[PDB]
Design a protein around this motif. Structure first.
Motif, PDB file in Angstrom:
ATOM      1  N   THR B  59       0.807  -1.145   0.000  1.00 54.04           N
ATOM      2  CA  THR B  59       0.000   0.000   0.000  1.00 54.04           C
ATOM      3  C   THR B  59       0.837   1.186   0.000  1.00 54.04           C
ATOM      4  O   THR B  59       0.505   2.212  -0.562  1.00 54.04           O
ATOM      5  N   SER B  63       2.612   4.998  -4.481  1.00 51.01           N
ATOM      6  CA  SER B  63       1.241   5.160  -4.716  1.00 51.01           C
ATOM      7  C   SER B  63       0.729   6.492  -5.146  1.00 51.01           C
ATOM      8  O   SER B  63       1.243   7.561  -4.843  1.00 51.01           O
ATOM      9  N   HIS B  65      -2.820   6.948  -4.988  1.00 47.85           N
ATOM     10  CA  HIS B  65      -4.106   6.413  -4.604  1.00 47.85           C
ATOM     11  C   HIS B  65      -5.155   7.281  -5.097  1.00 47.85           C
ATOM     12  O   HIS B  65      -5.051   8.493  -5.014  1.00 47.85           O
ATOM     13  N   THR B  68      -7.724   3.214  -4.253  1.00 46.17           N
ATOM     14  CA  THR B  68      -7.263   2.354  -3.251  1.00 46.17           C
ATOM     15  C   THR B  68      -7.344   2.976  -1.953  1.00 46.17           C
ATOM     16  O   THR B  68      -7.327   2.324  -0.939  1.00 46.17           O
ATOM     17  N   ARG B  72      -8.630   1.565   1.601  1.00 45.60           N
ATOM     18  CA  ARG B  72      -7.963   1.544   2.837  1.00 45.60           C
ATOM     19  C   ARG B  72      -8.910   1.793   3.903  1.00 45.60           C
ATOM     20  O   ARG B  72      -8.875   1.159   4.935  1.00 45.60           O
TER      21      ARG B  72
END
Lengths: 112, 161
Positions: B59, B63, B65, B68, B72
């Motif tokens: 993660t 990233s 994001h 995602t 999380r």
């Protein structure tokens, strides 16, 4: 007019000032139900902060009580109560503070 | 699932499947997470947890994001639940750390959520370390969020008089 409009004429900043003033004034000018009526509203708004002022103004007020207030004054803080941690805390603490002095005494020290 | 005779294994095979998720599509992923949570009688857990941690590393990554992230939050929920049931462990500590890294409110909210919870939960020990951890984190940091954080914690208080 002020009350209403300001409500729907916004700006938090104004509220700060006015709050402070109002804070002193309370029951020398009565019209309790209305005034309460207002006060509730002022709080209604979010902001821990917005909410907070109604309680602080109140201290000069509460202490003095008005055309009906002492009994009830005692009843109210109970009736209206809040979590939200530090907002929780504000309710708790004021209470706790309240908790801590004979409310008559309490009023005298704090007020001044 | 209402094959409530619900065999052990099957629950277990999930991870494998889950691995595939790393080729994202959150929405799908999301469906997974809910799905996933379910099986765990606070067990097939570790291997997972570990894996979660793997996820966690994953993660991190580099990233960018967008999808995602969501995951999380969800994950954390999914995750949250388990813990309630479970006795949980170091893994958890790591969130605490992890959380320190991060910079957005929603997490703080979770955290906070945790604040609450933990306040209820108190077996305590961990907390103290964490409180230490936090102390670092804290020293190590500034923000409204933090600022707020302090307040509660401050509120909380105990030793090291």
């Amino acid at each position: 007019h002020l009350c209403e409009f300001i409500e729907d004429c916004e700006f938090t900043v104004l509220a700060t000032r006015i709050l402070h003033l109002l804070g002193q004034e309370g029951p020398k000018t009565n019209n309790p139900s209305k005034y309460i009526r207002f006060i509730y509203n002022r709080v209604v708004l979010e902001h821990e902060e917005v909410r907070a002022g109604a309680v602080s103004a109140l201290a000069k007020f509460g202490a003095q009580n008005e055309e009906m207030l002492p009994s009830i004054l005692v009843l109210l803080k109970r009736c209206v109560m809040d979590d939200d941690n530090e907002v929780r805390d504000r309710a708790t603490f004021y209470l706790n503070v309240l908790e801590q002095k004979q409310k008559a005494l309490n009023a005298g020290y704090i007020l001044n | 699932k209402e094959h409530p005779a619900h065999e052990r294994v099957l629950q277990d095979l999930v991870m494998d499947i889950l691995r595939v998720l790393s080729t994202p599509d959150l929405e799908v992923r999301k469906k997974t997470l809910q799905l996933a949570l379910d099986l765990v009688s606070s067990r097939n857990v570790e291997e997972l947890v570990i894996v979660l941690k793997k996820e966690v590393i994953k993660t991190n990554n580099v990233s960018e994001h967008e999808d995602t992230d969501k995951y999380r939050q969800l994950l954390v929920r999914t995750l949250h639940s388990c813990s309630v049931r479970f006795p949980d462990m170091a893994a958890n500590v790591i969130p605490v750390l992890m959380e320190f890294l991060s910079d957005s409110n929603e997490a703080a909210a979770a955290d906070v959520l945790e604040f609450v919870r933990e306040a209820i939960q108190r077996f305590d020990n961990l907390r103290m370390l964490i409180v230490e951890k936090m102390l670092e984190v804290f020293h190590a940091i500034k923000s409204v969020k933090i600022y707020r954080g302090a307040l509660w914690i401050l509120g909380e208080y105990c030793s090291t008089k």
